[PDB]
Amino acid sequence: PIFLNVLEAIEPGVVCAGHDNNQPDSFAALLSSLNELGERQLVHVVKWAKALPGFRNLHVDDQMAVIQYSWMGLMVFAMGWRSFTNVNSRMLYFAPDLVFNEYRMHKSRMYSQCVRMRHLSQEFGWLQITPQEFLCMKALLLFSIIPVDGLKNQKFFDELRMNYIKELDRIIACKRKNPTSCSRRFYQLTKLLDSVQPIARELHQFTFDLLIKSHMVSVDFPEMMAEIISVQVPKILSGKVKPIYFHTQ
Ligand SMILES: C[C@]12CC[C@H]3[C@@H](CCC4=CC(=O)CC[C@@]43C)[C@@H]1CC[C@@H]2O
Ligand SMILES: O=C(O)c1cccc(CSCc2ccc(Cl)cc2Cl)c1
Ligand SMILES: O=C(O)c1cccc(CSCc2ccc(Cl)cc2Cl)c1
């Protein structure tokens, strides 16, 4: 089971937000912390993507590209998994030092999005996602958003992505026999993967808006997040980069 040994080996540990929970909950302080958390998770995402099977087959510019388009979806999905395993999805477990309860949801001014993330989180429970299904789904999220005109080497990207689809099909299928089941299950996992995208997009709009007005509102964006949110998020927002959906929406 080489493919899973690797996914299971390179999975990131806990990342702390650095939030001072002694501060009173405020928009400026909650969002600044979520932003630092994002900066910190990006270092780990980069290191993890580059250790994935087949990832350095991609053109070097394409490597930076797929990471910079898909981090939001990756991080949302993983946070939903954390939330699911650490607090049965009752709260959003951004990090051990930044757990959102209902008060933090309203104060962050992202109540509706948080609610949608909580929903995502509860699906892991509703569908009984195994840890192997989770790891393979999250790997496939690295490959689920690309420019409409293609990458530098799109042919490589297509092959890699096809392979990651087959690995997920394999993880479902090391277990079952009479194949209504395997067929139903693949359908649920692809539907769940698709559902990450509309949420990632709401958060794209949100953080963009907020970067634009950050000075007026005392929210800090660190270097990389400011750069990625000014340079790559708008390509998504302007429709020049789009998610790859399994089913028509
Ligand atoms: C992008 C963002 C900072 C980073 C947040 C993001 C919401 C989802 C999220 C979950 C994580 O586990 C890491 C941080 C991130 C990626 C936030 C929405 C508004 C804020 O600007
Ligand atoms: O280097 C970083 O920490 C960073 C920060 C934000 C976004 C990305 C995407 S780069 C992924 C990558 C691909 C190829 C090479 Cl040579 C080198 C790299 Cl770092 C990387
Ligand atoms: O072990 C695996 O499952 C695995 C998973 C993903 C990718 C790869 C290697 S694919 C990388 C690749 C890139 C371009 C082309 Cl044309 C052809 C290929 Cl085979 C192997």
Side-chain angles (χ1 to χ4, degrees), residues 1-22 24-89 91-154 156-165 167-176 179-183 185-222 224-249:
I2 289 153
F3 180 72
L4 283 169
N5 283 165
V6 175
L7 288 197
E8 160 187 23
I10 62 163
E11 190 58 17
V14 162
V15 179
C16 288
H19 189 245
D20 170 31
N21 286 280
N22 250 44
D25 293 329
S26 71
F27 180 65
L30 289 171
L31 271 292
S32 294
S33 289
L34 273 180
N35 290 345
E36 175 66 24
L37 182 58
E39 190 84 358
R40 291 173 186 196
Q41 298 197 6
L42 211 21
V43 167
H44 294 262
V45 177
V46 164
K47 294 184 194 151
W48 161 89
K50 304 213 305 191
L52 274 159
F55 190 80
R56 353 229 296 171
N57 284 345
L58 297 179
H59 197 285
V60 60
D61 297 306
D62 286 351
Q63 291 179 220
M64 182 175 254
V66 306
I67 294 163
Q68 274 159 358
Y69 306 146
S70 77
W71 54 278
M72 179 75 74
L74 282 165
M75 292 176 190
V76 172
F77 193 68
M79 183 278 277
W81 179 254
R82 283 192 302 275
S83 288
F84 167 65
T85 60
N86 309 328
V87 297
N88 188 50
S89 305
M91 303 197 276
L92 298 176
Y93 195 96
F94 295 96
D97 57 342
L98 201 59
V99 186
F100 274 33
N101 57 15
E102 275 246 341
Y103 192 66
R104 285 164 165 191
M105 292 180 205
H106 170 91
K107 298 300 283 168
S108 77
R109 305 183 197 168
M110 298 196 271
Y111 191 94
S112 37
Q113 301 85 355
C114 290
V115 145
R116 294 194 77 197
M117 290 185 273
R118 195 162 74 219
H119 288 351
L120 170 60
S121 183
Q122 307 183 113
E123 279 288 300
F124 291 112
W126 294 135
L127 302 163
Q128 289 173 270
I129 304 301
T130 68
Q132 289 83 10
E133 270 165 356
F134 163 80
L135 288 174
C136 192
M137 282 191 289
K138 168 152 85 41
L140 190 62
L141 283 175
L142 181 61
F143 308 113
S144 299
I145 171 160
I146 58 180
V148 297
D149 5 59
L151 297 162
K152 256 78 155 191
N153 191 29
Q154 186 67 51
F156 291 171
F157 173 102
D158 292 340
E159 177 91 4
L160 199 53
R161 171 181 163 87
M162 163 180 76
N163 292 339
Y164 275 81
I165 292 167
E167 287 305 326
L168 175 62
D169 190 58
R170 177 194 275 85
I171 272 147
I172 288 155
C174 276
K175 214 49 167 37
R176 311 104 153 118
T180 306
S181 193
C182 288
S183 161
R185 184 55 155 196
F186 184 85
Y187 181 81
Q188 301 162 340
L189 303 198
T190 54
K191 290 310 265 174
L192 176 61
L193 280 168
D194 279 356
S195 87
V196 173
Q197 306 298 343
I199 311 180
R201 202 215 167 73
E202 296 209 41
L203 295 159
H204 283 137
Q205 198 59 257
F206 192 100
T207 192
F208 175 78
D209 281 336
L210 173 62
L211 172 74
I212 294 311
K213 76 186 163 74
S214 51
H215 55 310
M216 285 315 293
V217 92
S218 306
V219 168
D220 270 65
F221 285 75
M224 293 175 318
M225 292 278 285
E227 213 263 325
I228 289 159
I229 293 161
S230 61
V231 175
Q232 323 281 176
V233 170
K235 301 193 189 156
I236 304 177
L237 291 181
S238 74
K240 302 162 63 173
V241 171
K242 293 170 95 155
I244 309 165
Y245 287 98
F246 281 100
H247 314 269
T248 76
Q249 298 290 280

